[PDB]
Amino acid sequence: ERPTFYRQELNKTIWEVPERYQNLSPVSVCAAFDTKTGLRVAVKKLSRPFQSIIHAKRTYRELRLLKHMKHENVIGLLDVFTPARSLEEFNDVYLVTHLMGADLNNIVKSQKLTDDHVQFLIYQILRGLKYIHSADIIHRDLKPSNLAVNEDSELKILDFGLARATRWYRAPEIMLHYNQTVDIWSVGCIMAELLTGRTLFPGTDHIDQLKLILRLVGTPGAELLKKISSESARNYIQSLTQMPKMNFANVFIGANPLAVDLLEKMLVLDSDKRITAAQALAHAYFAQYHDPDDEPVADPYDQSFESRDLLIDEWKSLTYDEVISFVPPP
Numbered sequence: 001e002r003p004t005f006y007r008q009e010l011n012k013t014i015w016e017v018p019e020r021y022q023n024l025s026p027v028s029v030c031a032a033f034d035t036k037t038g039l040r041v042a043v044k045k046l047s048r049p050f051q052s053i054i055h056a057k058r059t060y061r062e063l064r065l066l067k068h069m070k071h072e073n074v075i076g077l078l079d080v081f082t083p084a085r086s087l088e089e090f091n092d093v094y095l096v097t098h099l100m101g102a103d104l105n106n107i108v109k110s111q112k113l114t115d116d117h118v119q120f121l122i123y124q125i126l127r128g129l130k131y132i133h134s135a136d137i138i139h140r141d142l143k144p145s146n147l148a149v150n151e152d153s154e155l156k157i158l159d160f161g162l163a164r165a166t167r168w169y170r171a172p173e174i175m176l177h178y179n180q181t182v183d184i185w186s187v188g189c190i191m192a193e194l195l196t197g198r199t200l201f202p203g204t205d206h207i208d209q210l211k212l213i214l215r216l217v218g219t220p221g222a223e224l225l226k227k228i229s230s231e232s233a234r235n236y237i238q239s240l241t242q243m244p245k246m247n248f249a250n251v252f253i254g255a256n257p258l259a260v261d262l263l264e265k266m267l268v269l270d271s272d273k274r275i276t277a278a279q280a281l282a283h284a285y286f287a288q289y290h291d292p293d294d295e296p297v298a299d300p301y302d303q304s305f306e307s308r309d310l311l312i313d314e315w316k317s318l319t320y321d322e323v324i325s326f327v328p329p330p
């Protein structure tokens with residue numbers, strides 16, 4: 001039924017969680033120990049979940065996403081609770097997931113990694129991306145800071161499908177008509193940073209970002225230019241002077257030739273010609289880890305709520321229904 005909640009203030013806010021979650025420490029997200037399972041968990045308290053319609057919709061969206069995903073390389077909902085015992089008093093939402101311990105930015109420390117650690121880290125990203133994309137969901141903001149990694153170099157993806165600031169890993173079509181391969185471009189930027197130890201495109205603005213991107217992959221041809229309707233976007237690409245496409249063998253010299261070939265297939269300007277997650281998993285670069293019978297897909301995700309403009313109270317009760325109906329995973 002109902003458990004005992006205790007209150008404790010951290011990060012200048014008051015946390016109220018069941019007694020089964022002990023030793024809360026901030027990392028708004030806290031690290032905590034679940035005395036029921038013996039697991040170290042990550043606890044997230046949603047900030048002002050129903051302050052506005054946008055906040056209420058995003059609160060509902062985040063809860064719907066976590067309840068759907070059941071994948072090894074995708075963060076999932078272990079528990080969700082609220083101290084309120086009625087809908088009217090409902091104004092707090094807590095999310096409990098696995099605690100990996102660090103992000104990809106922390107464990108990398110801006111250092112070069114072996115080709116095999118790169119193989120393993122990138123394989124988990126694509127393996128989880130395939131599951132996410134099979135549910136018809138785009139991450140849109142894949143970056144090292146939302147890739148949770150433990151001391152075993154195991155990886156889970158965070159914050160997928162949440163976003164609708166520096167954008168070093170955003171596909172060049174989001175800045176400046178796009179599909180799921182916008183996440184594949186982010187994987188290429190991440191994989192390039194793991195191999196060489198520097199940010200591939202350290203842009204200072206959206207135009208400086210574009211200049212660094214075009215300098216590597218080259219100025220587009222007519223078959224790509226004819227698919228851009230934005231007269232401003234077509235201007236920036238062409239008004240930026242002619243730039244020959246770099247040799248990826250020279251940009252990533254010393255790296256595994258199979259790694260360079262995969263990067264050329266990921267960092268394609270034309271998103272219509274960009275490799276997908278499933279095709280990337282079948283690339284020869286992942287020969288040591290690829291198994292088609294262990295790269296499962298997801299059930300269909302009901303996304304129709306995204307196209308609805310509802311009041312705050314409606315998004316709140318829908319969120320409330322999802323909290324009461326939650327069943328913990330095995």
Ligand SMILES: Cc1ccc(C(=O)Nc2ccon2)cc1-c1cnc2c(c1)[nH]c(=O)n2C(C)(C)C
Nearest residue numbers: 042043044062095099100101102148158159160
């Ligand atoms: C608690 C929580 C709740 C929801 C979401 C989430 O991803 N929300 C989504 C997903 C799709 O849409 N919205 C993420 C977390 C979470 C945050 N940080 C975590 C973590 C889990 N596990 C970790 O190890 N860490 C760090 C090491 C501290 C990085």
